[PDB]
């Protein structure tokens, strides 16, 4: 009998109920908001109130039997900015008295979509972003390098910071948190040095050939330490170059830079990313550095092989316009050296209508087919359409017309890396 036991309130479990789980009615140790959960024990008969870190929760009094009933976990319930007094809990009221419960709440499981750079030095800053980060108490990096000093995380938890630390493994991998709302993994792509094409520091070796006004030489890099929290390691490329400056208000390939291609590059299929891996799942990876804004006019186009003319939005090449955010020009500039992730996805040849690319096997295929296998970039500025970004029709009307520019862009650690995230969920099957 559900309605028999004593008078005199007592929580004995908690149970969370879920109609599209293999264990619907399952015995928790927590909650997040949203949630139907089951409060056995006994005493419940005359419930009036149910406070859940003190805010009034609703509940059918008709599903209240004397040992079990039915409360969802309110949209609203505070989590971490809940009063510490009331801070996971929950309490019973009914005219004979009230009964305290501690029992951890939280909101959505924590989400890292970004990690702002993915090959910094030794005691650089991190920031790491996406939601749910709020009060991160470990961050565990490749090779088990434990971090719980030095975290500071955003109220709203849509980042955390934290310093890179010594021993990192050079096999790299993702990151793990520990926060408030549980755990969390970041793509597999953090320190990912196996995945290296070309560093200018003896990873990889540069391509240089011809006279053109376009060609970066072996000769015409830069190697001064520039950039505020990540600074630039060893030697790396400037684009354009000083003596190509100002860069013609509407040309294409006004600065180029490539890898050895042709003999010495490595076989991709050695960079750790299984052949069987879908183009959403791996990516070309970089550091980039803008130290004064740029907008209005220039892109990057990165060239899967050397075939390309320059001014195309079409082949195995993807073309960086990191100052149109949402259509909208936005300048950007960076205080040191952040990532760049271009998923394989993203490029046009994977957006394409018939030998479209579905795996990273099509991506090695492609480049073992290729006329010139180098790897490389353009700095390009000619005008640009939403659409040639977007979608084919919508966008088409909003142009954003190419002017002179004498813009100053730094790229280095060109490298494949895997975009895999490890599976984290509160019970697994
Ligand atoms: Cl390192
Ligand atoms: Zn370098």
Known sequence: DDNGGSSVMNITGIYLEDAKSNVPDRLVDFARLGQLIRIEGEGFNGLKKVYINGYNCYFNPVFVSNKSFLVSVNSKVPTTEADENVRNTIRLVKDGGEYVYDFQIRAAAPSITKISNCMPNVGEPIIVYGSGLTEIAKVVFPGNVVVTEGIISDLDGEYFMVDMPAGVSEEGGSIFVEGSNGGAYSPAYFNYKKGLLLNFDG???????????????????????????????????????????????????????????????????????????????????????????????????????????????????????????????????????????????????????????????????????????????????????????????????????????????????????????????????
Request: net charge negative.
């Open 203 to 429: 990873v990889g070796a540069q391509g240089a050939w011809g006279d053109s006004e376009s060609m970066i030489q072996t000769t015409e890099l830069e190697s001064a330490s520039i950039g505020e929290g990540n600074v630039s390691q060893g030697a790396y490329c400037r684009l354009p170059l000083e003596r190509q400056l100002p860069v013609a208000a509407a040309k294409n390939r006004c600065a180029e830079v490539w890898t050895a291609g042709n003999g010495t590059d490595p076989d991709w299929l050695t960079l750790g990313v299984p052949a069987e891996t879908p183009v959403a799942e791996c990516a070309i990876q970089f550091e980039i550095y803008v130290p004064e804004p740029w907008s209005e006019s220039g892109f990057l186009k990165i060239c899967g092989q050397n075939g390309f003319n320059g001014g195309e939005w079409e082949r195995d090449c993807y073309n960086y316009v990191p100052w149109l955010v949402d259509g909208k020009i936005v300048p950007f500039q960076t205080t040191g050296w952040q990532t760049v992730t271009v998923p394989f996805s993203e490029f046009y040849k994977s957006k394409a209508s018939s030998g479209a690319w579905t795996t990273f096997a099509d991506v090695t295929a492609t480049r073992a087919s290729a006329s010139y296998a180098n790897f490389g970039f353009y700095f390009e500025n000619s005008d640009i359409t939403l659409d040639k970004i977007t979608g084919a029709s919508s966008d088409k009307e909003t142009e954003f017309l190419s002017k002179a520019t004498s813009v100053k862009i730094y790229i280095d650690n060109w490298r494949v890396v895997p975009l895999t995230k490890p599976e984290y969920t509160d019970f697994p099957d």
